[model samples]
Target: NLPTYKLVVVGDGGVGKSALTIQFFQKIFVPDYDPTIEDSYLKHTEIDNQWAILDVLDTAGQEEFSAMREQYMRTGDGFLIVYSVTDKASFEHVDRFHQLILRVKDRESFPMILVANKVDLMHLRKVTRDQGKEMATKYNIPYIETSAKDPPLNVDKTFHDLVRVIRQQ
Candidate 1:
């Protein structure tokens, strides 16, 4: 049996965190949805021959939940710091989220996958994959730009890619 894992889908609110969470959770391909976080756990799936579980802390833009953020950090096995390719502000905010993962965890040794979500909307995208990758490189993390709505788009690959990187560590 595959064990459950704690992974976070975090970023500034309104950057499609919930949409990606729900889309990836329900295993649907819907493009329009909301991602509010009254509860933490979000999605689950099998990736790279392991049971992968995701808990959405909904930490995005939530300054009031600082304590909750600290608690969540202690339990996280990995992180998916998501931003929107179309939103330059979200892209700029990536460093702050990355730092939080490092600080709250009290160790910067966990595996993190830096995500620039909504890449299917790349025509309207303000940030490029290379730009996001550059930041991930600077932070010593993996990077991926993906869309939850595009046909045949697979978030599974991202999971496996990160798993491969984590296994390397």
Candidate 2:
């Protein structure tokens, strides 16, 4: 039997973390949603050829929830550490997010997928694809680029890829 995995989405404010998370399950791009401290959703999906539930939590981007992040980090089984391709600062923030996860989980390495969201705005891409790929390579995690607003997106693939990798572990 497949297991239910707890997955969290984290990053700096306006990085499209919420867009990616909501689009994955809702299959529609939510241009805006209320800020989340943590938005939980339970979805039955296929993971590694077996049925499983994905318990997803889209975390708040506000710094005020710093302590809450560590609390959730310790319990999460997998993660989608998101950054916006058009935002350089948000891309740099991934490094700190990954490091904190390591400390809270007490693991040097774990199941994590580095996501470069908002790929549709290529004209304004401050963080190049090479940069995001390099970051993922350094962290030894899978990386993917997605556009939450567009059809035929990688939103689902993002979570599915992470779930597949999580199942392999």
Candidate 3:
């Protein structure tokens, strides 16, 4: 009934941050948020189970977003750092997000998950699963693949897995 985990979904713009969060929380397709502002928040249940609720802060996806990310991370319980699988640049940006998280959380042990989104288009994938795994392993975070267009994508499972990891820690 009450909030449990506070997860922040962050990454560069056009990487499906809005769509992904909408799908996970609302089970609907949100096309685009025009002039997408500096902040947005969504709350949902289960993620994959029925125990705890997730309050997801969809922060600004631009440079302006960077100034506020540290504050968001300071109070965030966990983070879902997403990058489009089809976009190598976005994938590479995840490292910087990881670094920011550490600085914000003031702890290298912060709970963080590296998400390779838009994996439905396999041929278009510029970043491979191995690459994601290497990054995650290198940063000591778990890795997952998801696609907003593919209903079969186990995004819910990915959220649950991350929840389990955070809860254990």
Candidate 4:
């Protein structure tokens, strides 16, 4: 097998975490609202002229699972820290995920990507693009605004962007 990159998906519930990953990996948007616990997915891709397996660990964003977040953080080679652009509370709560990841990884900085998901729902957006950019600035991570439900989406770019980041550093 080629080198494997473990990417952790973290964010609040109903924030389109599963939607983005499933759409990227399966090319179908699941319209149902099934709550996620913990799920893993694999994708094989060529990055920087090298073949690699991308292992995506989809994590639940419910508050009751807080105790396990740190454990999951430590296993990741990179993280996809996401928040809903239409949900202000979820955006505000992203800091907790950021701090936990840093504490568990024991690094001031690491290879990670911050995403403001659901840009397709801009009409319902409670979290502005500037706010998302500011959060990324505060955390010192590259950020992108993506809409998983829309065509010409950024779902692939979000994950691929991090793969490039990991390969570079």
> TM-score: which candidate is best?
2
Per-residue lDDT tens digits for candidate 1, residues 1-169, read 4445666678877676666665655667655444444346645666665665555554554557565666676787777888888889999998887888788777855778888888777479889778998998998888887777745354766656655665567
lDDT of model 3, residue 89: 95
- Candidate 2 residue spans exceeding 4 A from truth: 61-71
Q: How close is candidate 1 to the true structure, as a TM-score?
A: 0.80
Where is model 4 more than 4 Å wrong at Cα?
61-71
Model 4 lDDT-worst window of ten? 61-70
TM-scores of all models?
Answer: 0.80, 0.91, 0.84, 0.89
What's the lDDT of the predicted structure labeled candidate 2?
0.84
lDDT of each: 0.70, 0.84, 0.76, 0.82
Residue 17 local lDDT, model 1: 69
Off by over 4 Å in 1: 30-32, 42-45, 51-68, 163-167
Please write out the lDDT profile of model 3 over residues 1-169, one tens digit for every residue: 5557877888877787777776776677666664365554555565444667676777664655466665566788888898998899998899888888888788867887888888888688798889999999998888888876647376676667767778879
Q: Estimate the TM-score for candidate 4.
A: 0.89
Model 3 residue 89 distance off true place after TM-score fit, in angstroms: 0.9
Model 1: per-residue Cα lDDT at residue 100: 81
Q: For model 2, how does the per-residue alpha-carbon lDDT over 109-161 read when each residue is reduced to its tens digit?
A: 98999999888896898998899999999999998999989683688889999
Residue 151 C-alpha lDDT in model 2: 84
Could you tell which candidate, 3 or 4, scores higher by lDDT? Answer: 4
Better of 2 and 3 by lDDT: 2
Clashing pairs in 3: none
